[PDB]
Design a protein around this ligand. Structure first.
Ligand SMILES: Nc1ncnc2c1ncn2[C@@H]1O[C@H](COP(=O)(O)OP(=O)(O)O)[C@@H](O)[C@H]1O
Ligand SMILES: [Mg+2]
Length: 259
């Protein structure tokens, strides 16, 4: 969205590597507004016109959104070099790697909290008529308070049967993906279907196989997963319902006691 003048940006250091260039952290001080810490995606020089457009497309997409569970876009730098995409800063980075570094360090209530935010963000996106198509733990960022937000607006084992076979992507297929994500979270970053091959995964799902309950996962959360993994997309829950279901679990914590 908004075009930012390089004079307002002061890069601090490298915090990650994107496919289009380095990812940094830094300060943003717009005229009048108060300085803030941000994340800065840069484009490697010598880029092709296609690379430039694809890179900036990500900003155009997320720029059209605005929700606490969707990565906030501060703006972009295109008039001068390097080209940049400034966004919200998420100290804990990617959710999957984040969970791997904290194996079994959270309560069911915390995990459910993370899943609720992701659900709220997807509910928002669905209402805005946006189909992510690539929902997965690696595409969700987490901050200090553990708030998870959907990212990557620029994967067999994560995709619904129909989407894989007929390339039919809908919010419904995102619900299936959300199911896999729920598994990833309760598994603390474990890879879905483990070392199974992508083809094995396809044949397994065909044979009505479904990922088992992750360790210490309440039977109520695994059932919600199954619902998300229903062969018939029309039967899968809506993100709105997924949210309410999660909310009900928060009301009466004893509903998560049945292991
Ligand atoms: N807003 C952000 N705050 C903190 N770290 C970030 C942020 N965006 C990206 N990163 C870090 O940079 C890495 C690469 O960025 P990512 O957006 O996942 O790449 P791409 O979407 O280009 O494939 C992430 O795995 C994460 O650790
Ligand atoms: Mg990524």
């Amino acid at each position: 969205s908004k075009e930012i003048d390089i004079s307002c940006v002061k890069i601090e250091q490298v915090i990650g590597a994107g496919e289009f260039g380095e990812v940094c952290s830094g300060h943003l001080k717009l005229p009048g507004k108060r300085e803030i810490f941000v994340a800065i995606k840069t484009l490697k020089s010598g880029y092709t016109e296609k690379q430039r457009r694809d890179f900036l497309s990500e900003a155009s997409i997320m720029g059209q959104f605005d929700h606490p569970n969707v990565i906030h876009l501060e703006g972009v730098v295109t008039k001068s070099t390097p080209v940049m995409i400034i966004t919200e800063f998420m100290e804990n980075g990617s959710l999957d790697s984040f969970l791997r570094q904290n194996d079994g360090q959270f309560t069911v209530i915390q995990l459910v909290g993370m899943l609720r935010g992701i659900a709220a963000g997807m509910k928002y996106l669905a209402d805005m008529n946006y189909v992510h198509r690539a929902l997965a733990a690696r595409n969700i960022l987490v901050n200090s308070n553990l708030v998870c937000k959907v990212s990557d607006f620029g994967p067999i084992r994560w995709t619904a049967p129909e989407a894989i076979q007929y390339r039919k992507f809908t919010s419904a297929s995102d619900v299936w993906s959300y199911g896999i994500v729920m598994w990833e979270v309760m598994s603390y970053g474990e890879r879905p279907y483990w070392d199974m091959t992508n083809q094995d995964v396809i044949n397994a799902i065909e044979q009505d196989y479904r990922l088992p309950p992750p360790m210490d996962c309440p039977s109520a959360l695994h059932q919600l997963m199954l619902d998300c993994w229903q062969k018939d997309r029309n039967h899968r829950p809506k993100f709105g319902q997924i949210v309410n279901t999660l909310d009900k679990m928060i009301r009466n914590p004893n509903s998560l006691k049945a292991m």
